[PDB]
Design an enzyme around this catalytic site. Structure first.
Site, PDB file in Angstrom:
ATOM      1  N   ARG A 252      42.187  55.860  40.139  1.00 26.48           N
ATOM      2  CA  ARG A 252      42.529  54.502  40.440  1.00 26.48           C
ATOM      3  C   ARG A 252      44.031  54.370  40.189  1.00 26.48           C
ATOM      4  O   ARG A 252      44.684  55.320  39.763  1.00 26.48           O
ATOM      5  CB  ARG A 252      41.710  53.472  39.666  1.00 26.48           C
TER       6      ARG A 252
ATOM      7  N   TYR B 199      44.748  47.197  44.305  1.00 28.43           N
ATOM      8  CA  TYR B 199      46.179  47.148  44.031  1.00 28.43           C
ATOM      9  C   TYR B 199      46.985  47.410  45.287  1.00 28.43           C
ATOM     10  O   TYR B 199      46.538  48.083  46.248  1.00 28.43           O
ATOM     11  CB  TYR B 199      46.550  48.187  42.966  1.00 28.43           C
TER      12      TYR B 199
ATOM     13  N   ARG C  64      40.563  53.194  30.080  1.00 25.80           N
ATOM     14  CA  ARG C  64      41.445  53.952  29.240  1.00 25.80           C
ATOM     15  C   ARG C  64      40.606  54.988  28.479  1.00 25.80           C
ATOM     16  O   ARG C  64      39.766  54.613  27.673  1.00 25.80           O
ATOM     17  CB  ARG C  64      42.179  53.013  28.273  1.00 25.80           C
TER      18      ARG C  64
ATOM     19  N   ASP D 147      48.801  36.249  44.373  1.00 23.36           N
ATOM     20  CA  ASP D 147      47.992  36.942  43.415  1.00 23.36           C
ATOM     21  C   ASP D 147      46.532  36.738  43.814  1.00 23.36           C
ATOM     22  O   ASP D 147      46.244  35.958  44.725  1.00 23.36           O
ATOM     23  CB  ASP D 147      48.319  36.477  41.995  1.00 23.36           C
TER      24      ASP D 147
ATOM     25  N   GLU E 106      52.931  41.774  34.290  1.00 26.35           N
ATOM     26  CA  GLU E 106      52.152  43.004  34.367  1.00 26.35           C
ATOM     27  C   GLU E 106      52.506  43.734  35.669  1.00 26.35           C
ATOM     28  O   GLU E 106      52.792  43.117  36.686  1.00 26.35           O
ATOM     29  CB  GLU E 106      50.649  42.740  34.434  1.00 26.35           C
TER      30      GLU E 106
ATOM     31  N   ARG F 286      39.122  41.085  45.595  1.00 31.23           N
ATOM     32  CA  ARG F 286      39.966  42.115  46.099  1.00 31.23           C
ATOM     33  C   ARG F 286      39.381  42.649  47.427  1.00 31.23           C
ATOM     34  O   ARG F 286      38.915  43.807  47.540  1.00 31.23           O
ATOM     35  CB  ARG F 286      40.172  43.213  45.051  1.00 31.23           C
TER      36      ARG F 286
ATOM     37  N   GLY G 139      49.927  32.222  36.327  1.00 29.00           N
ATOM     38  CA  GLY G 139      50.337  32.016  37.720  1.00 29.00           C
ATOM     39  C   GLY G 139      49.549  32.807  38.769  1.00 29.00           C
ATOM     40  O   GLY G 139      49.196  33.985  38.610  1.00 29.00           O
TER      41      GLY G 139
ATOM     42  N   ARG H 225      52.741  40.749  38.358  1.00 27.94           N
ATOM     43  CA  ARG H 225      51.411  40.105  38.193  1.00 27.94           C
ATOM     44  C   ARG H 225      51.399  39.278  36.904  1.00 27.94           C
ATOM     45  O   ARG H 225      51.610  39.818  35.823  1.00 27.94           O
ATOM     46  CB  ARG H 225      50.336  41.165  38.118  1.00 27.94           C
ATOM     47  N   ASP H 226      51.310  37.959  37.062  1.00 31.08           N
ATOM     48  CA  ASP H 226      51.173  37.034  35.880  1.00 31.08           C
ATOM     49  C   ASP H 226      49.697  36.950  35.639  1.00 31.08           C
ATOM     50  O   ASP H 226      48.994  36.383  36.485  1.00 31.08           O
ATOM     51  CB  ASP H 226      51.773  35.665  36.214  1.00 31.08           C
TER      52      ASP H 226
ATOM     53  N   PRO I 286      41.979  36.931  36.907  1.00 26.83           N
ATOM     54  CA  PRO I 286      43.340  36.491  36.571  1.00 26.83           C
ATOM     55  C   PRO I 286      44.520  37.127  37.284  1.00 26.83           C
ATOM     56  O   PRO I 286      45.610  36.583  37.186  1.00 26.83           O
ATOM     57  CB  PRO I 286      43.380  36.818  35.054  1.00 26.83           C
TER      58      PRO I 286
HETATM   59  C1  LIG Z   1      45.569  46.030  29.851  1.00 27.00           C
HETATM   60  C2  LIG Z   1      45.934  44.923  30.792  1.00 27.00           C
HETATM   61  C3  LIG Z   1      46.120  45.412  32.209  1.00 27.00           C
HETATM   62  C4  LIG Z   1      46.920  44.495  33.180  1.00 27.00           C
HETATM   63  C5  LIG Z   1      46.444  43.103  33.254  1.00 27.00           C
HETATM   64  O1  LIG Z   1      44.766  45.711  32.623  1.00 27.00           O
HETATM   65  C6  LIG Z   1      44.748  46.419  33.875  1.00 27.00           C
HETATM   66  C7  LIG Z   1      43.834  45.790  34.856  1.00 27.00           C
HETATM   67  C8  LIG Z   1      43.188  46.443  35.836  1.00 27.00           C
HETATM   68  C9  LIG Z   1      42.667  45.700  36.948  1.00 27.00           C
HETATM   69  O2  LIG Z   1      42.831  44.438  37.004  1.00 27.00           O
HETATM   70  O3  LIG Z   1      42.022  46.309  37.803  1.00 27.00           O
HETATM   71  C10 LIG Z   1      43.065  47.930  35.815  1.00 27.00           C
HETATM   72  C11 LIG Z   1      44.164  48.568  34.989  1.00 27.00           C
HETATM   73  N1  LIG Z   1      43.889  50.011  34.805  1.00 27.00           N
HETATM   74  C12 LIG Z   1      44.333  47.865  33.629  1.00 27.00           C
HETATM   75  N2  LIG Z   1      45.325  48.560  32.850  1.00 27.00           N
HETATM   76  C13 LIG Z   1      45.105  49.266  31.746  1.00 27.00           C
HETATM   77  C14 LIG Z   1      46.304  49.903  31.122  1.00 27.00           C
HETATM   78  O4  LIG Z   1      44.003  49.353  31.272  1.00 27.00           O
HETATM   79 CA   LIG Z   2      47.582  35.637  38.130  1.00 24.58          CA
END
Ligand SMILES: CCC(CC)O[C@@H]1C=C(C(=O)O)C[C@H](N)[C@H]1NC(C)=O
Ligand SMILES: [Ca+2]
Ligand SMILES: *[C@@H]1O[C@H](CO)[C@@H](O[C@@H]2O[C@H](CO)[C@@H](O[C@@H]3O[C@H](CO[C@H]4O[C@H](CO[C@H]5O[C@H](CO)[C@@H](O)[C@H](O)[C@@H]5O)[C@@H](O)[C@H](O[C@H]5O[C@H](CO)[C@@H](O)[C@H](O)[C@@H]5O)[C@@H]4O)[C@@H](O)[C@H](O[C@H]4O[C@H](CO)[C@@H](O)[C@H](O)[C@@H]4O)[C@@H]3O)[C@H](O)[C@H]2NC(C)=O)[C@H](O)[C@H]1NC(C)=O
Ligand SMILES: *[C@@H]1O[C@H](CO)[C@@H](O[C@@H]2O[C@H](CO)[C@@H](O[C@@H]3O[C@H](CO[C@H]4O[C@H](CO[C@H]5O[C@H](CO)[C@@H](O)[C@H](O)[C@@H]5O)[C@@H](O)[C@H](O[C@H]5O[C@H](CO)[C@@H](O)[C@H](O)[C@@H]5O)[C@@H]4O)[C@@H](O)[C@H](O[C@H]4O[C@H](CO)[C@@H](O)[C@H](O)[C@@H]4O)[C@@H]3O)[C@H](O)[C@H]2NC(C)=O)[C@H](O)[C@H]1NC(C)=O
Ligand SMILES: *[C@@H]1O[C@H](CO)[C@@H](O[C@@H]2O[C@H](CO)[C@@H](O[C@@H]3O[C@H](CO[C@H]4O[C@H](CO[C@H]5O[C@H](CO)[C@@H](O)[C@H](O)[C@@H]5O)[C@@H](O)[C@H](O[C@H]5O[C@H](CO)[C@@H](O)[C@H](O)[C@@H]5O)[C@@H]4O)[C@@H](O)[C@H](O)[C@@H]3O)[C@H](O)[C@H]2NC(C)=O)[C@H](O)[C@H]1NC(C)=O
Ligand SMILES: *[C@@H]1O[C@H](CO)[C@@H](O[C@@H]2O[C@H](CO)[C@@H](O[C@@H]3O[C@H](CO[C@H]4O[C@H](CO[C@H]5O[C@H](CO)[C@@H](O)[C@H](O)[C@@H]5O)[C@@H](O)[C@H](O[C@H]5O[C@H](CO)[C@@H](O)[C@H](O)[C@@H]5O)[C@@H]4O)[C@@H](O)[C@H](O)[C@@H]3O)[C@H](O)[C@H]2NC(C)=O)[C@H](O)[C@H]1NC(C)=O
Ligand SMILES: *[C@@H]1O[C@H](CO)[C@@H](O[C@@H]2O[C@H](CO)[C@@H](O)[C@H](O)[C@H]2NC(C)=O)[C@H](O)[C@H]1NC(C)=O
Ligand SMILES: *[C@@H]1O[C@H](CO)[C@@H](O[C@@H]2O[C@H](CO)[C@@H](O)[C@H](O)[C@H]2NC(C)=O)[C@H](O)[C@H]1NC(C)=O
Ligand SMILES: *[C@@H]1O[C@H](CO)[C@@H](O[C@@H]2O[C@H](CO)[C@@H](O)[C@H](O)[C@H]2NC(C)=O)[C@H](O)[C@H]1NC(C)=O
Ligand SMILES: CCC(CC)O[C@@H]1C=C(C(=O)O)C[C@H](N)[C@H]1NC(C)=O
Ligand SMILES: CCC(CC)O[C@@H]1C=C(C(=O)O)C[C@H](N)[C@H]1NC(C)=O
Ligand SMILES: CCC(CC)O[C@@H]1C=C(C(=O)O)C[C@H](N)[C@H]1NC(C)=O
Ligand SMILES: *[C@@H]1O[C@H](CO)[C@@H](O)[C@H](O)[C@H]1NC(C)=O
Ligand SMILES: [Ca+2]
Ligand SMILES: [Ca+2]
Ligand SMILES: [Ca+2]
Lengths: 389, 389, 389, 389
Positions: free
Chosen positions: D37, D325, D71, D244, D196, D291, D217, D212-213, D267
């Site tokens: 991913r 993404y 993770r 977003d 983010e 998504r 937002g 990414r807020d 979010p």
């Molecule tokens: C830890 C917060 C972060 C950004 C909002 O979460 C992300 C969200 C994700 C997502 O919204 O799909 C997947 C990402 N793999 C994750 N990042 C990590 C490092 O785990």
């Molecule tokens: Ca947002």
């Protein structure tokens, strides 16, 4: 492009950062991944590579059955790009056999493999991918070597080899190579009583080899090598922090000049240490009985002080997971003013600790030093043995 | 880079060290490994590679059924990095066909394949990876060649080819190539009565090809080629130690100038020898009847003395294991003042000797000379046929 | 490196020798081989590579179901080392889409793919592995191109493209590229009435493209391009030996300037010819109805003489085996004074002719000219469809 | 080779052309493809490569079970040749961990991976394939970074990193690297309230990061970096076109200096935009909730004008297919006088939206700008989830 000189001192180390992890057993549950054991890493001017002894079968193959066995005509030293898992498709055969070492002198790579029957083994010494030299067994009992990288200085690469009993006095020698050709052979001298599976690194013109005494000591032997004079001395790690497996509880006081005995049930495991005064780190399994867990302990003056104990620790592999051999290597060609310690842990899966499968293999994790205070978690193998049942 | 010349003498050889083993059938039980036969090795300035005739299927594939068959439009000469097993992913197609030879002249590699129907086969001669010359059958009966490497001197690479019956007099020619172009064609001269599958090596400006008489002789023909004068002579190995399979028991005296008849049930196998006066080594199957086992015999003056017998030996493959073809190669680009003999053995698995499977394939082992007295053990294939049932 | 100039004549061709064969469907029964169609070969200063349109699935994968479909977002032009089968592991993605061409100008390779919906397709033109130019559909109906290599001269590489109906008058253009940039665009001129899938080669400063009239003709259109003036003419092959499929029986007289109708039930197939006066060769399917068999016919003055017929023949694929598209290529960088004609045949397996499987794929065979009179045999695909049931 | 300087303006973009597509999930149904991913692409002087975070298992492997999890110690940043699917055989391990970025500075590649437990994570910064620097967590809560490429200017490569809550105010920093060494660290300043997963590109000496807020937002934060002064500002995209996911309906006006809140149930998602006055393009999912789908909207002055809305659109992924993404990259080494925008879309398959399988993975599509008006179609993943049941 020039011969490596071990001019640089070791880098200060306060914690350990992740360098590589191949997740071989996880991947090899479905992909065509070779069965291995006795892995290591070794670098050269272009980068680092993983190395191990193949069993000449894949992990899911029917021939994985019986791979606890150590020595067969089907084993070979293979190398591959660091971080990939070892497949039949991405691996270079370095030499054929069941005990190995390898190192790069700055110009080309030397690889050595022992093969043959227990009473009549021989080493073949390769340089730049060609065979240069052969060395017959001198004691008729499993001629063998480091199972991690050797080290070179101004083209001279010492290699520690043993021939003889694994459970009694044996005949160890230090052979000094240049371009694969024997420059000198020395018999082991000094106070180490038994030598197996040395883990060696260089700094400030000195090579230190931290070994496995499989006969007596739960403290590890240390061979100190001058690669210019081609001479050595041997003794034990001084520290009371015992780092073989199996081992007894750490005593009040270690012993620089004789083995500290005890422990049950196994006589040793390959391991390592970096010895640089205050900047000294000892690896060991967390268990004092089994190859489970792995921890790094900062033990100032471990090489010289029989009362030295740990002042820091980092768990590498939690004690609920299987570990295995460990060894030293350094990227001697990094763009740094100091040589940064690195090490690997072999994460053994299957027999004999996990007898629900017919095989024995491993994966690899590798870490290098940092001067920072980094957080840590457990870098265990990660495969689910149920999936292989 | 320059054209290779063969001016160096052969190295003294007292025993044989392991060079490579690919464990292809063990690995191919699970991984995608091509079905092959007729393997060999050949070297160049950079190193050595493995070669074989693919059957255009994997070993576990359904199309492995029927691969005892020799000649199909699905075969090709493939090459790969020494020690790997041959997969669809790591193999170079050198040429298309069902009989081959290859050799490097110091500048580029020449590879030759024959293909086509029995009555109308043709060779295509490649150089540097491009097709240069084509040669149509001259006798209308399976135009074919060495199945091991050719040898080159000052740009000239002789190749021995046969066209005609495999069980009666045939039309053998020596074709002298330079950059893949015909410099000269000779009909076979001298006292060899039938020539197949020559195993050739160079030393002292002379190329010697030790062949298979598939008509009458259990002794092996020897063709001696001068690559400067582009001429040759032929006769038989003189020794009483007979080296084809099948063969009778070794007689009291060999015969330099006629085939020695006898043996059952098979007319021949590709083999080899190194002929250098006292420094002479003959390979053969251990069985006089079947392609099982493989031994090296040091037979001083095998080339010249009908009464010559062995003074030493080395079992390469025990007689409980299947062997196959064997052939000569040398790393003519080694850093050595002499050319060191090497050889391989084809370890045939499957049909016809193992008829519980539908396929025929092989693995490879290769060894080179040592002046030392090395121990030895059997380097058999190591696959369990039950696993393929 | 320099731009290729088409300065040499065609080599004399009397017969055809085997260049490569990939055995992709046999291998891909078990190994991970991509589903393809529309293959070709194309060379460069270093050698020749195989090319095809992947379907973005392996042959044994579930997604092979439905791969008779021509245009999806999952297709790409892939290239791989000549002779290997195309796997996910050995293939280079040249561009994304469902119609392609590619050629090397002597400096770098230009690759072109069309993608998109029927009414809104577009080409992307790549040079040296980077995207240079985009071309929108001009007629809103499957903008599309050669499906075999283009040809370059002094850095100018003409490509023929069509947009419009496959069964009626369409809008064909010749676009002249240099380093992937458009130098000139021409509408098709002359007497060819419909152009698809041109197979092009160069000699003596002239590019000839032998195409598929999918509308009316069983005779093939011929476009003659001057890559210096960037101009062209068109007409039909004169010969009475009709080379599209389907076709009627050969009439007593061809037609240089109009389509000859007839044939059932297929409107066309990609094909090729080499046209060089007496040295002229026409490929076609053996079947006049269906993509079965493949033959080379030597037809002196095919380009100019409506009464020209064959003087020699070579069967490439017997008429008990499936063929497919065929096309021209030349190794313009060979070490010869002439440019030697080569061709390939696409050996289509599966749907629609073999409806016991759910997929459609192909393997490749390629041959080049010989001046010699070589024997031949059938180079059919070789896979057993029953193994895929 | 020299350091990249961001001297060129963005190219005009009127539509988007296909650059690459790996078809990973289709291929991985049967071939050995890693679960991944968080993919992206990044270029260098030689071309472009794909990147993603492996899960240390193949897709058909039993270990694919549970790969929704973000993770683990079994993840790594891998890179591979553009357009191939990521297998264990063709992927380079860049660094070990579960959040990454990478970029090339014109001389060598920098890659950064975070690993460790949530309360004690650390970054390791690699340059030229060797580890240079390590950074410990500053806020004890999942130190993390962009998940698409960074951008360099005169050797300085800024990277945005966050540590702290994903659902509240967090500690974002911009770390400026040269040759993997820290030149400067800045705390986030300005009006962005949460940052983010920044998607960054460079033009005319300015680096713009569209992030990414994840707290408030549905409009995206925009960080503007001066890589020479090593300073920045932050605010939100002005445009009423919210990009977003999840997001509410687009309001009458956007807000340049504060979040526009609302939407359900998620979010945020990583996304991107190119901001260049009229020449401004915004990506977003077609669905405002999930998504699903992906569209490019040309929104003149999106960066400055709160009333700006779309003047053109191109559907990249139809809204009957899953997206994921998305991120920016540019081939800064193209032979163009401008830098041409590119982007990728991560096509997520499996959990949570497709609960009939136990895994989560993705494939990749990538597109770059065209000045032409090209047709479009949907570049959805193309795998049949039923085949995985
Ligand atoms: C830890 C917060 C972060 C950004 C909002 O979460 C992300 C969200 C994700 C997502 O919204 O799909 C997947 C990402 N793999 C994750 N990042 C990590 C490092 O785990
Ligand atoms: Ca947002
Ligand atoms: C450590 O390793 C080294 C190297 O790997 C190893 O060294 C070997 O040491 C042994 C002695 O221990 C050496 O053996 C010598 O071999 C000589 C030649 O042997 C071969 O040829 C014989 C003659 O064959 C002909 O005639 C016979 C009979 O008419 C006929 O069958 C044959 O076809 C042929 O015409 C043959 O008999 C012999 O057969 C043996 O080996 C074969 C396989 O090759 C096997 O199938 C047989 O079943 C049988 O085992 C062989 O093929 C031999 O002449 C020589 O014999 C003289 O000396 C001994 C004393 O040692 C006397 O007993 C004898 O009377 C003879 O005058 C001797 O046997 C061998 O050559 C060394 N090899 C090398 C490479 O150095 C060590 O053994 C290893 N150490 C340990 C502990 O393992
Ligand atoms: C070693 O291999 C080589 C390499 O393959 C091989 O050499 C070939 O040898 C044969 C003779 O054995 C040569 O064949 C010659 O071909 C000439 C041209 O044939 C083609 O065209 C013929 C006419 O086609 C047109 O007309 C008919 C109506 O007449 C119409 O159907 C067609 O559609 C078209 O309009 C055609 O009849 C002929 O068909 C044969 O071949 C095709 C494959 O292409 C096959 O499908 C058919 O079933 C049929 O076999 C072909 O398509 C031809 O003119 C010539 O005829 C003269 O010679 C023979 C004697 O050989 C006389 O008997 C006859 O009366 C004529 O005077 C002959 O048939 C071929 O050209 C050689 N090829 C090469 C590359 O050299 C060797 O034979 C092989 N050796 C062995 C031992 O196998
Ligand atoms: C972010 O991660 C950081 C990196 O891991 C981490 O920083 C770590 O913080 C901890 C807690 O402050 C520090 O611990 C300190 O460690 C020293 C060294 O302790 C080690 O040695 C002692 C003594 O061993 C000997 O004597 C014992 C006692 O008789 C015998 O059993 C033994 O055989 C020896 O002879 C040992 O007792 C310690 O035991 C711990 O660790 C092991 C694993 O190595 C466990 O198995 C065991 O149960 C126990 O947990 C240890 O081996 C000690 O003297 C101090 O008192 C203190 O414990 C780390 O040193 C420090 N590491 C580094 C690299 O900086 C942060 O804590 C982390 N942050 C968060 C929030 O998680
Ligand atoms: C060959 O392919 C070409 C490439 O795709 C194609 O060219 C396209 O031609 C079409 C038809 O002329 C053009 O459409 C025009 O687009 C603009 C902009 O449209 C976008 O924005 C509007 C406004 O969105 C905002 O407000 C609405 C409603 O209040 C909100 O819902 C939305 O959130 C925003 O706040 C939006 O309504 C449009 O919606 C369409 O597209 C989306 C996908 O993005 C769909 O989900 C949706 O159902 C609907 O179909 C859109 O998002 C518009 O203002 C014009 O009036 C006109 O629609 C393309 O811009 C043009 N593209 C390019 C790159 O040139 C050719 O049509 C094609 N040829 C053939 C024969 O197929
Ligand atoms: C794993 O290997 C062992 C050892 O080869 C196999 O056990 C043998 O099985 C054979 C055939 O049934 C018996 O005749 C032998 O006597 C057994 N030997 C021993 C030492 O047990 C076992 O079958 C293999 N298992 C699998 C699943 O292949
Ligand atoms: C292996 O190949 C043989 C030969 O093609 C197959 O044997 C044939 O099987 C077919 C199909 O059932 C029969 O019609 C014929 O009687 C057989 N021919 C011969 C020469 O025996 C055999 O089925 C194949 N086996 C497998 C498992 O693929
Ligand atoms: C997928 O992963 C889950 C989680 O590890 C597996 O669920 C466990 O299954 C075992 C054996 O059935 C049970 O003892 C545990 O109770 C389950 N654990 C949890 C946390 O649910 C599940 O079996 C796996 N599925 C497959 C097909 O491998
Ligand atoms: C033969 C003695 C030697 C050192 C004690 O045994 C090693 C122990 C091993 C072990 O303790 O796991 C495995 C090694 N593969 C083995 N080496 C060889 C060459 O077989
Ligand atoms: C055709 C005669 C030739 C030499 C005797 O037969 C060989 C024997 C073989 C053998 O004895 O095993 C296998 C070879 N693949 C075959 N060669 C060809 C070209 O088919
Ligand atoms: C669209 C017309 C074109 C030429 C007649 O159809 C071709 C015929 C084909 C065929 O006859 O087999 C297969 C080709 N893949 C197809 N091309 C495309 C682009 O779909
Ligand atoms: C043979 O090659 C060697 C080493 O390259 C060279 O020194 C010698 O001159 C050569 N001899 C001839 C006659 O070519
Ligand atoms: Ca011990
Ligand atoms: Ca014989
Ligand atoms: Ca037609």
């Amino acid at each position: 492009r020039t011969f490596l000189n071990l001019t640089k001192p070791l880098c200060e180390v306060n914690s350990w950062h992740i360098l590589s992890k191949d997740n071989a057993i996880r991947i090899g549950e479905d992909a065509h991944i070779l069965v291995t054991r006795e892995p290591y890493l070794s670098c050269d001017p272009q980068g680092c590579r993983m190395f191990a002894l193949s069993q000449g079968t894949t992990l899911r193959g029917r021939h994985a059955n019986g791979t606890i066995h150590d020595r067969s005509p089907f084993r070979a030293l293979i190398s591959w790009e660091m971080g990939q898992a070892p497949s039949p498709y991405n691996t270079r055969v370095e030499c054929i056999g069941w005990s190995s070492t390898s190192c790069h002198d700055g110009m080309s790579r030397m690889s050595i493999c022992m093969s043959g029957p227990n009473n009549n083994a021989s080493a073949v010494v390769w340089y730049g991918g060609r065979p240069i030299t052969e060395i017959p067994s001198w004691a008729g009992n499993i001629l063998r070597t480091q199972e991690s990288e050797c080290v070179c200085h101004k083209g001279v690469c010492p290699v520690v080899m043993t021939d003889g009993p694994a459970n009694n006095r044996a005949a160890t020698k230090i052979i000094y190579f240049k371009e694969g050709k024997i420059q000198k052979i020395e018999e082991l001298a000094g106070n180490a009583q038994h030598i197996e599976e040395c883990s060696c690194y260089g700094a400030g013109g000195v090579i230190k080899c931290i070994c496995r005494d499989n006969w007596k000591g739960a403290n590890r032997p240390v061979i100190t090598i001058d690669p210019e004079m081609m001479t050595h001395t041997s003794k034990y790690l001084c520290s009371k922090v015992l780092t073989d497996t199996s081992r007894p509880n750490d005593p009040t006081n270690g012993n620089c000049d004789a083995p500290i005995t005890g422990g049950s049930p196994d006589p040793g495991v390959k391991g390592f240490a970096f010895l640089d005064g205050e900047n000294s780190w000892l690896g060991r399994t967390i268990s004092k009985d089994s190859r489970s867990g792995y921890e790094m302990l900062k033990v100032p003056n471990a090489e010289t002080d029989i009362q030295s104990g740990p002042i820091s620790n980092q768990v590498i592999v939690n004690n609920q997971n299987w570990s295995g051999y460990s060894g030293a290597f350094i990227d001697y060609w990094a763009n740094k003013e100091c040589f940064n310690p690195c090490f690997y842990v072999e994460l053994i899966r299957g027999r004999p600790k996990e007898s629900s499968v017919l095989w024995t293999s491993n994966s690899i994790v590798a870490l290098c030093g940092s001067k920072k205070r980094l957080g840590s978690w457990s870098w265990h193998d990660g495969a689910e043995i149920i999936y292989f049942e």
